[PDB]
């Protein structure tokens, strides 16, 4: 007939199934202990991607038909606001669905139950515009730049023995991108040679290509030329056919004509002092000999994407015909050279006058863990930009979840019991998280829940789950914090996404017969 | 998603199975009575690879899903610092997993148990300070040059009946190699025949090419010519373009022009007395006729790598265009000839004035096992370079393993009950090595264990396992020693490599591509 | 200073509907006069255009390459 058969009890189930499968993978991830996961696919995937961050793994692939991809999509919007630290938002929403089994006991009207979601907005408002944050982050700020939350984000990740140093580096990267840009022009590559630093910060853009066997090793006071059209020449409009001559003397012009093309390139080039040429395509052989003798390095088939970032960096140019060298071309000059990083051979562009666009080069020990760092950069840049803009934060390590849980228990008894069972269930969702934080620690889960609740009830926001301790302690000393708006959106989002498929009884069918 | 997921007993087990599978194949390889192994796989392999060296085979192939590939990768970093000799580092790490079965007779947190790895650090120190080692091996050295570690690397190899004599030769080769020259100019080939020496040392370079069937059989007072550019002529930097000539009469001049290239070559050639010409690439036919009449032996498409090595040896040359012969080129002049040493003919370059850049040619029975020597000699060059650079070594034949084992037994009891169970498991791991070396000998393993422990606990470091005797004996008389850093790194590497597998509980894999 | 020009016909020129056929020529040099004819087409476009004050040109079809250089300088 057509569309998919869902209403009443079966429709509820699809939401139910999606939530349980996702929660087990993400639950392990939360907190400094956090477990890394390896995923395998061999066709369009280079290698197993560990992807410690839960948000990144769900968005990259839409594995199947059940509804969950859209719920996942919202988290990136949250990410734009902040949305990271350690993933916790998805888990709370899933457990809302677990007592729905209890709801079939009622056996008649789910709508009365729905008013509970509105109640949640009341309950979740006691978590935002409440407690305390930190009041630092002036913007730029030299010492508050890091050694804080980014390290915390990385605490879960295994690489943090040498990695924590890398996280510190990333804020410098966010500070340089400050301005009228947004999030653009950042390039990151990694290397197989081990060193204590495990990374290096460069003044410009990195590209892997070489002109050929001949050509000078390095140039100074470098000028950059980019051409839309290749250096290949001959047929143009009207080939003039294929030519048979009457004698040797007439053919002198054809060989000579090629020379003129060579002459324009050399004569114009010499005045400028041209040190490097970058072309996004095939290049004609005659100029190649010239560049080597002149002292000029050229790049064949340079990637267009690399070229566009470079243009902002060098001040840009207008790309057209050989009229291109001089004023129509803007060259930014510091140093352009091909250099050896531990083992690999690369070409480095550096010394940008603009300062707007920059590139980060990572080295590392020589590990599976080393490829992990590539994963880390995307996460690093997002955390810091938001933290300065929001100017607000919350205590991590489960501190936030237990405090809210104490408040919600009171709410259930306030309402009539049929309503109360539905309201209480949202409330006990919070309780499972404390259990998980302790469980990955290896400490006894039963003991931990009792002691945890008593300290939160008292009124100390700072107090939280100390996994290393095995009991409870001061989260703030640890330095683990979560951004303020990660919490505002999760509480509103978790409720209505689930609600839209539970609000309605009869629905969407067209006209079978 | 649908990815393979395991818990508690199965998750640990996948790691457990990988360690046991590797140990059985590697055990045969260890010590003076090792076994040759041949592995065959279909596609992208081509022919049988038999590797005596354990590290080379693990690196090459990732046979299946179970994780062990990363553990394997660590051995190579060790190799740069020291590597080979005999492989024992991988075996020890694998057996640490067997005691984990007893760990289930506990159940909550393995990490307290993980204190054993810290304990293992204590074990590493005892190995490094105890014993006696060796001192000097300072430089060049007269009798300490070999009849030591190289012999031992070879001991695990069957060829060591006449082969040990070959190993002894290799140190002389390293003495010339060592300096600011770095690792260059070493080439070795085995040949058909029958002699007790089974090897010849060539002061020059060994090649296998011929000018043609014609040409002088032997050249004396030889002059050597090496050309970067080929003998082929028709291109140039200026083409004279596409050629069509008014009528057929002119084409005759072009053929004559070819004669000039032939003729220029002969005029320069006769005065010098040129005995041999070597060109790295295609050779034009006209010159070929010339060389035969002159009494000059030429080589076509000689490999470039052989050529660079030869230049350092002869005195070098400025290998340019045909202006190249004379003063601009230096030619050594002892004797160059084509010699049938046995039944297979090769060309011999010898009698170099310089003295630092030699080639070694080996003689053997006639079949694979001799090629085994090709495997072994290449390995040998690396062993000697490290032994002089490290300036540290330990006694071989398993002497090192039993001594450390005696010390660790005390440690298990010294700690309190739970620590003692985990501490003792590490200690028993050392016990298998004495057993592994004795078993391949052909003597019953059980008899060997009791006698061995008694001699080591006495306080004699030199005493070890003597396979030849069928009991135990004095290792020092044999001349068997192992490089010192192999032991530092294995103990340090074994702990964290194994530890990462255990530290993560309940490995879960899901929701990927 | 936006002024708008719309053309039913492309800036492309050559075939007309009377080809002059596929064209010979004794030497490459003679084909030069053909290029020159193309140049006149560029000039008519600019001479009339500057006088109007032309700020933008919109054509519903393919556009010949020669005028493009002209428009850029103008």
Whether A229 contacts chain B with CB within 8 A: no
* A75, A484, A494 from A127: Cα distances, Å: 19, 10, 15
DSSP state of B492: H
Chains linked to B by 3 or more Cβ pairs within 8 Å = A
Cα(A462)–Cα(A476) distance, integer angstroms: 6
Neighbours of A175 (CB within 10 A): 16
Residues A180, A220, single domain; the answer is: no
Chain A nearest-CA residue for C32: A240
Chain A (406-425) residues lying within 8 Å, Cβ to Cβ, of chain B = none
Cα(B86)–Cα(B55) distance, integer angstroms: 10
Residues A22, A38, single domain; the answer is: yes
Residues B344, B421, single domain; the answer is: no
Whether B253 contacts chain A with CB within 8 A: no
**Phi, then psi, of A420 in degrees rounded to 5:** -60, -40
Residue bearing tokens 């840049």: A381
Chains B and A touch (3+ CB pairs under 8 A): yes
Chain A nearest-CA distance from B411, in A, is 26
Q: What CATH number does the domain containing A180 carry?
A: 3.30.260.10
Q: How many helices (H) and strands (E) does chain B have?
A: 18, 16
| Residue A437 in tokens | 């934080």
Q: Pick from B387, B353, B382, B484: which is nearest to B177 by CA? A: B382
Chain C nearest-CA distance from A258, in A, is 14
Cα(B469)–Cα(B442) distance, integer angstroms: 11
Cα(B164)–Cα(B196) distance, integer angstroms: 12
Q: Pick from B168, B204, B192, B205: which is nearest to B362 by CA? A: B192
Cα(A141)–Cα(A130) distance, integer angstroms: 26
- What's the structural domain count of chain B? 3
List CB contacts (< 8 A) between A245 and chain B: 244
Chain B (72-101) residues lying within 8 Å, Cβ to Cβ, of chain A = 73, 77
* A27, A397, A467, B225, B269 from A93: Cα distances, Å: 13, 19, 24, 81, 90
Output the CA torsion B452→B456→B462→B466 (10° steps). 0
Whether B44 contacts chain A with CB within 8 A: no
List CB contacts (< 8 A) between B508 and chain A: 24-25, 28, 35, 37
In sequence order, which ranges of B129-192 are alpha helices (DSSP H)? 149-155, 163-177
Cα(A43)–Cα(B389) distance, integer angstroms: 46
Neighbours of A269 (CB within 10 A): 19
- The answer for residues whose C-beta is within 8 angstroms of residue B76's C-beta and 6 or more apart is B55, B59, B83
- The answer for residues whose C-beta is within 8 angstroms of residue B170's C-beta and 6 or more apart is B146, B150, B360, B377, B380, B381, B384
Cα angle for residues C12, C13, C14 (degrees, 5° grid): 140
- The answer for residues whose C-beta is within 8 angstroms of residue B142's C-beta and 6 or more apart is none
In sequence order, which ranges of A391-513 are alpha helices (DSSP H)? 399-414, 417-441, 445-458, 475-478, 484-502
Q: Do A250 and C27 touch (CB under 8 A)?
A: yes
DSSP-based three-state secondary structure for A502: helix
Q: Do A243 and C28 touch (CB under 8 A)?
A: yes
| Residue A181 in tokens | 């840009």
**Phi, then psi, of B155 in degrees rounded to 5:** -60, -40
| Residue A262 in tokens | 């060579």
| Residue A494 in tokens | 């978790």
| Residue A418 in tokens | 């049929």
DSSP state of A109: -
Cα(B111)–Cα(B499) distance, integer angstroms: 9
Cα angle for residues B172, B176, B178 (degrees, 5° grid): 110
Neighbours of B145 (CB within 10 A): 19
**Phi, then psi, of A278 in degrees rounded to 5:** -120, 120
Residues B29, B102, single domain; the answer is: yes
Residues A175, A266, single domain; the answer is: no
Cα(B269)–Cα(B470) distance, integer angstroms: 67
Q: Pick from A209, A208, A219, A205: which is nearest to A292 by CA? A: A219
Cα(A222)–Cα(A225) distance, integer angstroms: 10
Last residue of a domain, one of B309, B333, B355: B355
Cα(B210)–Cα(B299) distance, integer angstroms: 6
Chain C nearest-CA residue for A320: C69
Cα(A290)–Cα(A296) distance, integer angstroms: 8
Contact (Cβ atoms closer than 8 angstroms) between residue B464 and residue B405: no
Residues A321, A379, single domain; the answer is: no
Residues in chain A: 513
Burial status of residue A1 (CB atoms within 10 A of its CB: 0-12, 13-18, 19 or more): exposed
| Residue B307 in tokens | 């050529």
Q: Do A251 and B242 touch (CB under 8 A)?
A: yes
Cα(B135)–Cα(B144) distance, integer angstroms: 11
Cα(A465)–Cα(A30) distance, integer angstroms: 12
Which of A20, A24, A48 to mutate to test binding with chain B, by most B CBs within 10 Å of its CB? A24
Q: Do B511 and A24 touch (CB under 8 A)?
A: no
Whether C28 contacts chain A with CB within 8 A: yes
Chain A nearest-CA distance from C65, in A, is 11
DSSP state of B467: T
- The answer for residues whose C-beta is within 8 angstroms of residue A265's C-beta and 6 or more apart is A231, A287, A290, A322
Output the CA torsion A25→A27→A29→A30 (10° steps). 160
* A2, A114, A196, B498 from A367: Cα distances, Å: 51, 51, 14, 15
Our measurement of the distance from residue A23's CA atom to the centroid of its chain's CA atoms, rounded to an integer in Å, reads 21
Last residue of a domain, one of A338, A355, A372: A355
- The answer for residues whose C-beta is within 8 angstroms of residue A511's C-beta and 6 or more apart is none
Chain C nearest-CA distance from A251, in A, is 10
* A13, A100, A109, A122, A422 from A104: Cα distances, Å: 12, 7, 9, 26, 12
Residue from the list B112, B245, B511 with its beta carbon closest to the beta carbon of A22: B511
State which H helix or E strand residue A59 sits in: helix A54-60
Cα(B310)–Cα(B347) distance, integer angstroms: 14
* B247, B258, B262 from B251: Cα distances, Å: 9, 12, 18
- The answer for residues whose C-beta is within 8 angstroms of residue B134's C-beta and 6 or more apart is B393, B481
Neighbours of B504 (CB within 10 A): 18
- The answer for residues whose C-beta is within 8 angstroms of residue A153's C-beta and 6 or more apart is A84, A85, A86, A167, A379, A380, A383
Strand partners, B442: none
Whether B107 contacts chain A with CB within 8 A: no
Q: Pick from A54, A66, A57, A50: which is nearest to A14 by CA? A: A66
- The answer for residues whose C-beta is within 8 angstroms of residue B223's C-beta and 6 or more apart is B272, B273, B274, B275, B276, B331, B333
Q: Is the dihedral of CA A200, A206, A210, A216 positive or negative?
A: negative
Whether C31 contacts chain A with CB within 8 A: yes
Cα(B272)–Cα(B317) distance, integer angstroms: 15
Chain B nearest-CA distance from A210, in A, is 22
Q: Look at strands B463-466 and B205-207 and give their pairing.
A: unpaired
List CB contacts (< 8 A) between C29 and chain A: 253
Residues in chain B: 513
Cα(A24)–Cα(A87) distance, integer angstroms: 12
Q: Is the dihedral of CA A482, A27, B101, A467 positive or negative?
A: positive
DSSP calls for B374-393:
HHHHHHHHHHHHHHHHH--E
Last residue of a domain, one of A336, A367, A391: A391
Burial status of residue C2 (CB atoms within 10 A of its CB: 0-12, 13-18, 19 or more): exposed
Residue bearing tokens 């038999």: B50
Q: What CATH number does the domain containing A82 carry?
A: 1.10.560.10
| Residue A472 in tokens | 């409870």
Residues in chain C: 74
b/e map of A9-23 (b: 16 or more CB within 10 Å)? eebbebbbebbebbb
Q: Pick from B483, B507, B495, B265: which is nearest to B384 by CA? A: B483
Q: Pick from A375, A381, A369, A374: which is nearest to A194 by CA? A: A369
Q: Do B111 and A58 touch (CB under 8 A)?
A: no
Q: Look at strands B393-395 and B297-300 and give their pairing.
A: unpaired
Q: Is the dihedral of CA B60, B66, B69, B74 positive or negative?
A: negative
Cα(A306)–Cα(A278) distance, integer angstroms: 10
Whether A214 contacts chain B with CB within 8 A: no
Longest pairwise C-alpha distance within chain C: 50
Cα(B359)–Cα(B357) distance, integer angstroms: 7
Output the CA torsion B145→B151→B153→B157 (10° steps). 150
Q: What CATH number does the domain containing A272 carry?
A: 3.50.7.10
- The answer for residues whose C-beta is within 8 angstroms of residue B221's C-beta and 6 or more apart is B273, B275, B333
List CB contacts (< 8 A) between C23 and chain A: 238
List CB contacts (< 8 A) between C27 and chain A: 250
Residues A428, A296, single domain; the answer is: no
Cα(A359)–Cα(A185) distance, integer angstroms: 8
Known binding-site residues of A for ATP equal: 31, 85-87, 482, 487
Residues B255, B351, single domain; the answer is: yes
Chain A nearest-CA distance from C4, in A, is 25
Cα(A437)–Cα(A34) distance, integer angstroms: 9
- The answer for residues whose C-beta is within 8 angstroms of residue B475's C-beta and 6 or more apart is B395, B396, B397, B399, B462, B463, B464, B466
Q: Do C28 and A253 touch (CB under 8 A)?
A: yes
- The answer for residues whose C-beta is within 8 angstroms of residue C29's C-beta and 6 or more apart is A253
Cα(A185)–Cα(A350) distance, integer angstroms: 14
Q: Pick from B424, B444, B425: which is nearest to B435 by CA? A: B444
Q: Pick from A249, B241, A259, A254: which is nearest to C28 by CA? A: A254
**Domain limits for position A63:** 1-133+392-513
Contact (Cβ atoms closer than 8 angstroms) between residue B386 and residue B136: no
For helices A368-390 and A163-176, give the axis angle rounded to 10 degrees. 50
DSSP calls for B121-147:
HHHHHHHTTSS-------SS-SSSSSS
Contact (Cβ atoms closer than 8 angstroms) between residue A257 and residue A171: no
Neighbours of A380 (CB within 10 A): 25
State which H helix or E strand residue B419 sits in: helix B417-441
b/e map of A270-299 (b: 16 or more CB within 10 Å)? eeebbbbbbbbeebbeebbeebbebebbbb
Q: Pick from B456, B457, B475: which is nearest to B467 by CA? A: B475
Cα(B480)–Cα(B468) distance, integer angstroms: 13
State which H helix or E strand residue B112 sits in: helix B110-113
Q: Pick from B7, B37, B33: which is nearest to B22 by CA? A: B37
Residues B191, B218, single domain; the answer is: no
List CB contacts (< 8 A) between B111 and chain A: 442
DSSP state of B349: E
| Residue A227 in tokens | 């051409």
Strand partners, B350: B335
Chains linked to C by 3 or more Cβ pairs within 8 Å = A
Strand partners, B276: B224, B297
User: Is residue C23 left, alpha or beta, with left meaning phi > 0 and alpha meaning psi from -120 to 50?
Assistant: beta
Q: Do A253 and C25 touch (CB under 8 A)?
A: no
DSSP calls for A114-158:
HHHHHHHHHHHTTTSS-S-------SS-SSTTSSSHHHHHHHSST
Q: Pick from B501, B109, B162: which is nearest to A440 by CA? A: B109
Q: Pick from A349, A353, A352: which is nearest to A361 by CA? A: A349
Integer-rounded Cα Rg, in Å, for chain A is 31
Whether A241 contacts chain C with CB within 8 A: yes
Neighbours of B253 (CB within 10 A): 9
Q: Is the dihedral of CA B399, B400, B401, B407 positive or negative?
A: positive
Chain B nearest-CA residue for A252: B240
| Residue C44 in tokens | 């008519």
How many alpha carbons fall within 13 Å on the CB side of residue C7? Answer: 13
B212 annotated as ligand-binding:
no
DSSP calls for A371-396:
HHHHHHHHHHHHHHHHHHHH--EEET
* A119, A237, A374, A462, B299 from A407: Cα distances, Å: 13, 80, 41, 17, 91
Contact (Cβ atoms closer than 8 angstroms) between residue B478 and residue B397: yes
Q: Pick from B320, B451, B343: which is nearest to B398 by CA? A: B451
DSSP state of B329: B
Residues B139, B120, single domain; the answer is: no
Integer-rounded Cα Rg, in Å, for chain C is 15
Q: Pick from B400, B319, B361: which is nearest to B131 by CA? A: B400
Integer-rounded Cα Rg, in Å, for chain B is 30
Q: Look at strands B218-220 and A344-350 and give their pairing.
A: unpaired
Contact (Cβ atoms closer than 8 angstroms) between residue B318 and residue B238: no
Whether C34 contacts chain A with CB within 8 A: yes
Edge-to-edge strand ranges of the sheet holding A335-341: A206-207, A344-350, A335-341, A218-220
Chain A nearest-CA distance from C63, in A, is 15
Residues B26, B66, single domain; the answer is: yes
State which H helix or E strand residue A200 sits in: strand A199-201
Cα(A450)–Cα(A438) distance, integer angstroms: 12
Residues A351, A207, single domain; the answer is: yes
């Amino acid at each position: 007939a057509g569309a998919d058969e869902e209403r009443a009890e079966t429709a509820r189930l699809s939401s139910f199934i999606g939530a349980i499968a996702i929660g087990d993978l993400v639950k392990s991830t939360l907190g400094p202990k956090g477990m890394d996961k390896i995923l395998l696919s061999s066709g369009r995937d280079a290698s197993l991607m560990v992807t410690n961050d839960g948000a990144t793994i769900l968005k990259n692939i839409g594995v199947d038909n059940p509804a969950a991809k859209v719920l996942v999509d919202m988290s990136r919007v949250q990410d734009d606001e902040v949305g990271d630290g350690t993933t916790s938002v998805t888990v709370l929403a899933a457990e809302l669905l677990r007592e729905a089994e209890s709801l079939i006991a009622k056996k008649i009207h789910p709508q009365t139950i729905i008013a509970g979601w509105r109640e949640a907005t009341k309950a979740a408002r006691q978590a935002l515009l409440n407690s305390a944050v930190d009041h630092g982050s002036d913007e730029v700020k030299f010492r508050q730049d890091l050694m804080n939350i980014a390290g915390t984000t990385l605490s879960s990740k295994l690489l943090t023995h040498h990695k924590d140093h890398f996280t510190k580096l990333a804020v410098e990267a966010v500070l340089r991108l400050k301005g009228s840009g947004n999030l653009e022009a950042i390039h990151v590559i990694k290397k197989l040679g081990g060193s204590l630093a495990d990374s290096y910060l460069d003044e410009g853009f990195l590209l892997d290509k070489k002109i050929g066997v001949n050509q000078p090793k390095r140039i100074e006071n470098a000028k950059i030329l980019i051409a839309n059209t290749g250096m290949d020449t001959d047929k143009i409009k009207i080939f003039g056919s294929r030519v048979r001559v009457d004698s040797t003397a007439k053919v002198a012009e054809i060989e000579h004509a090629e020379k003129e093309k060579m002459k324009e390139k050399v004569e114009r080039i010499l005045k400028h002092g041209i040190n490097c040429f970058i072309n996004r395509q095939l290049i004609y052989n005659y100029p190649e000999q010239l560049f080597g003798a002149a002292g000029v390095m050229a790049i064949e088939h340079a990637d267009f994407v690399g070229v566009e970032r470079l243009a902002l960096v060098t001040g840009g140019e207008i790309a057209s015909t050989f009229d291109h060298p001089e004023l129509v071309k803007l060259g930014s000059c510091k140093l352009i050279e091909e250099v050896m990083i531990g083992e690999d051979k690369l070409i480095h562009f550096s010394g940008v006058a603009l300062g707007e666009a920059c590139t980060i080069v990572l080295r590392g020990a020589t590990q599976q863990i080393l490829d992990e760092a590539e994963r880390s950069l995307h996460d690093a840049l997002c955390v810091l930009a938001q933290t300065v803009k929001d100017s607000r934060t919350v205590y991590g390590g489960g501190c936030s979840e237990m405090l809210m849980a104490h408040a919600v228990t009171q709410l259930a008894s306030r309402t009539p019991g049929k309503e109360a069972v539905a309201m209480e269930s949202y409330a006990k969702a919070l309780r499972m998280l404390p259990t998980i934080i302790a469980d990955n620690a290896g400490y006894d889960s039963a003991d931990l829940v009792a002691q945890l609740r008593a300290a939160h009830s008292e009124g100390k926001t700072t107090a939280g789950l100390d996994m290393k301790e095995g009991t409870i302690g001061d989260m703030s000393v640890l330095g683990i914090t979560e951004s303020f708006q990660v919490k505002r959106q999760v509480l509103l989002s978790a409720a209505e996404a689930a609600e839209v498929i539970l609000r309605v009884d009869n629905i969407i069918k067209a006209a079978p017969r």
